[PDB]
């Protein structure tokens, strides 16, 4: 579903091949790859559907980024680095950990300087260790002057126009992601609009529309893994998650200079290609446009997801305990709505 | 569970016997019968638990009421009379009928003068017809002068004190109920506090506490039979309603001069005794006391019922269609909270 691997310029061969993609149980179809000047691209972003833009130059100055350059210039701030035994780096919200004492995270977060991160990578590589690391840090004003120049050299003209055109809210942050080959961020949805700017290496992105909520089984909203799918894509439990047999994804492989629009509330699964080396991405997260004063029916799928989130949140507050939300919901439906 | 039939004064024999009670699948225990001067009675009404008060004199002037007296004096207003093929007079909300076109009521409502109601009773009796009628009309200012005198002669001193003592809201109405022997009002709960004043004949009252919500399976809040149990007490469907096998009722038989406190949100099933003649009741419905400014946890069962009602109401309004509430609730729980 990703599509035929693109041929690199100057007869450099296929950028990647299918053997670097993980194997899953569901079909996919390709996300369109278009020029930012293509009116179809503007039609997909306006309809809140995904598209890969090949020529935005959004992060053109960062395409020279590698570990050496970043370590030399990214400053001496702290970087959040996640470590795991497994390739799956499931996100967890540490604030919500108090609610569920039973949950024990597969991955661990450690704060370190950028040179320490590079050192751990080298150490793991040198000893042939199985540990995996994923660096995930929002860009902030502690970065070095060269990085500031690169950041200023992003294509703000194009993306500010997009923000204005769509009525989106403010840019909330830019997340720097540096991963090891084979790293996976499991399926989840975010609440903000995202322009996903690939810099180094290749990432396979599998997206699912908001109307596949009933096939992805997100954790309860109060659980630390709120917004993530409960389904283990590598070993799906069809008895607990029967409608995962009905999921269909939208797939693409993004490379240096590609920008993927991940619309808000769209599920996405992101994996750095096997044996593809390290990957570098910077995303651009924007608050969604304000809800219109006059709500129009029929509601969009993501509006219904928002309703469900808000019901779960209200019940948790009203009952005084997040653990009680499940029992009350079952009491409400059993023999009444099922 | 009703208790031994009481012996009538002056050696008149048992007022009723067990053979006049319908047979059901669940156990019961008796509602306490106490004097209004008994501090235990005041303790049960303050804790919102049911009690039968034997000596309130609440409707003492109405104990002389029969069909002849009422027809002569109740005026020429219209009375709501319900007619049914079966003994079960399931209440339905006519405003909510638009939401469910499929629902067809077992009983029919007709407006008529009191003498027409007495005539239908006589006609049915004379021809030995199987039709059943239940008169259910709130008292209003069209009543005759003698009825006004009787109404004024109720024990307002005692019940106004109760209203003040419990912090209840206003008296909202007095419902006059005249039924045929064997008539049944199926299990349901009301949202208002109720003093249930028996006048003529005997009624078996089976009550269930609000915490048995999960065993009584009320209809959806937007369904015309909102607040009524879906379970057919005469032929319970344990596959759809498995926890009806766990219901336990509180039972009593009220007679002329008895007043039953039916606390708000308490389920009640009310049947006029087989072969006991017509029954006459007047109830006293009061708005519950205002919710306290500081909510205290743990929540009461009826507060959790109120939460569920309000969730169902909000979703119906938000989705724009009452039919969609069931599907969204299932989507929210399946594989997530069950």
């Amino acid at each position: 579903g990703s599509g035929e691997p693109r041929e690199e310029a100057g007869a450099l061969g296929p950028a990647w091949d299918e053997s670097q993609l993980r194997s899953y149980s569901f079909p996919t179809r390709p996300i369109p790859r278009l020029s930012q000047s293509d009116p179809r691209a503007e039609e997909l972003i306006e309809n809140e559907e995904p598209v890969v833009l090949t020529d935005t130059n959004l992060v053109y100055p960062a395409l020279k980024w590698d570990l050496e350059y970043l370590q030399e210039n990214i400053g001496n701030g702290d970087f959040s680095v996640y470590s795991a035994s497994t390739h799956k780096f499931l996100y967890y919200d540490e604030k919500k950990m108090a609610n569920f004492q039973n949950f024990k995270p597969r991955s661990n977060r450690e704060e370190m300087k950028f040179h320490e991160f590079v050192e751990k990578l080298q150490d793991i590589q040198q000893r042939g260790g199985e540990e995996r690391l994923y660096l995930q840090q929002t860009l902030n004003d502690t970065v070095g002057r060269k990085i500031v120049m690169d950041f200023l050299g992003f294509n703000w003209n194009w993306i500010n126009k997009q923000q204005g055109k769509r009525g989106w809210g403010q840019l909330t942050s830019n997340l720097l992601l540096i991963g090891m080959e084979g790293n996976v961020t499991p399926a989840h949805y975010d609440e903000q609009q995202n322009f996903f700017a690939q810099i180094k290496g290749y990432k396979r992105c599998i997206l699912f529309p908001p109307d596949q909520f009933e096939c992805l089984y997100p954790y309860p909203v109060h659980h630390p893994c709120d917004r993530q799918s409960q389904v283990d894509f590598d070993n799906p439990d069809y008895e607990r998650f029967p409608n995962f047999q009905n999921v269909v994804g939208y797939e693409t492989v993004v490379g240096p200079g590609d920008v993927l629009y991940i619309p808000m509330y769209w599920w996405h699964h992101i994996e750095s290609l096997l044996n593809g080396g390290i990957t570098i991405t910077v995303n651009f997260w924007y608050k969604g446009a304000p809800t219109p004063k006059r709500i129009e029916y029929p509601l969009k799928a993501h509006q219904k997801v928002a309703i469900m989130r808000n019901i779960e949140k209200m019940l948790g507050e009203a009952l005084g305990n997040p653990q009680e939300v499940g029992p009350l919901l079952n009491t409400m439906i059993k023999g009444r709505y099922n | 569970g009703s208790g031994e039939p009481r012996e009538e004064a002056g050696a008149l024999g048992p007022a009723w016997d067990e053979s006049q009670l319908r047979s059901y699948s669940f156990p019961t225990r008796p509602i306490p019968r106490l004097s209004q001067s008994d501090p235990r009675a005041e303790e049960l009404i303050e804790n919102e638990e049911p009690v039968v008060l034997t000596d309130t004199n609440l409707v003492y002037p109405a104990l002389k009421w029969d069909l002849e007296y009422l027809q002569e004096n109740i005026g020429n207003g219209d009375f709501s009379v319900y007619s049914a093929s079966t003994h079960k007079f399931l209440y339905y909300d006519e405003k909510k009928m638009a939401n469910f076109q499929n629902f067809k009521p077992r009983s029919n409502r007709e407006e008529m003068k009191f003498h027409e109601f007495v005539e239908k009773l006589q006609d049915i009796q004379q021809r030995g017809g199987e039709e059943r009628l239940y008169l259910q009309q709130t008292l209003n200012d069209t009543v005759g002068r003698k009825i006004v005198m009787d109404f004024l002669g109720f024990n307002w001193n005692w019940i106004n004190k109760q209203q003040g003592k419990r912090g209840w809201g206003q008296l909202t109405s007095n419902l006059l109920l005249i039924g045929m022997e064997g008539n049944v009002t199926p299990a349901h709960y009301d949202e208002q506090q109720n003093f249930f004043a028996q006048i003529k004949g005997y009624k078996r009252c089976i009550l269930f506490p609000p915490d048995q919500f999960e065993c009584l399976y009320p209809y959806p809040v937007h369904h015309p039979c909102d607040r009524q149990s879906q379970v057919d007490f005469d032929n319970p469907d344990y596959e759809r309603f498995p926890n009806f096998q766990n219901v336990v009722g509180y039972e009593t038989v009220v007679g002329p001069g008895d007043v039953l406190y039916i606390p708000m949100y308490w389920w009640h099933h009310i049947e006029s005794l087989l072969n006991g003649g017509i029954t006459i009741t007047v109830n006293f419905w009061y708005k519950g006391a205002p919710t306290p400014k500081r909510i205290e946890y743990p929540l009461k069962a009826h507060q959790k019922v109120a939460i569920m009602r309000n969730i169902e109401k909000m979703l119906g309004e938000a989705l724009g269609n009452p039919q969609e509430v069931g599907p969204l609730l299932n989507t929210m729980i399946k594989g997530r909270y069950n």
């Binding site: 929002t138 961020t185 609440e191 969604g288 709500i295 309703i307 | -």
Partner: peptide, 14 residues
């Protein structure tokens, strides 16, 4: 309705 359809800004980051 407008209250219910409101959306947050939560993402996989602090």
């Amino acid at each position: 309705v407008k209250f219910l359809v409101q959306f947050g800004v939560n993402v996989n980051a602090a």
